[PDB]
Amino acid sequence: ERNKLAAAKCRNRRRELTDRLQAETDQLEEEKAELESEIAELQKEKERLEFVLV
């Protein structure tokens, strides 16, 4: 029970820094994944069009 309060009280301290950094990490991971899907889709479209011209 003493280590529960020790760890909880520990993490509650100045947790706003780690929360800002972790949130930013989340946004950047999502933006990353969606950018990757956009790149794949755009490459498929590019190959398609190039096929169309010929």
């Binding site: 020790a6 950094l21 972790q22 930013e24 990353k32 755009l42 490459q43 479209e45 590019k46």
Partner: protein, 66 residues
């Protein structure tokens, strides 16, 4: 009795020290992760912009040949 108070104070200070250490480690690791992710997202964003440009141009060509 005073020795008990001194000992609990010592334990408290130690737990605080190790807490601060682990916290700073986490903050450093997160900062590095954010920097890396920003770099990767810059490269990916530039690649996406170039690809959108190329697709637009290709569409222009297909249309011009109608």
């Amino acid at each position: 009795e005073r020795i008990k108070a001194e000992r609990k104070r010592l334990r408290n200070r130690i737990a605080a020290s190790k807490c601060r250490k682990r916290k700073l480690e986490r903050i450093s690791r997160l900062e590095e992760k954010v920097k890396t992710l920003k770099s990767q997202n810059t490269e990916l964003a530039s690649t996406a912009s170039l690809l959108r440009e190329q697709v637009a141009q290709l569409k222009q060509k297909v249309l011009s040949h109608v």
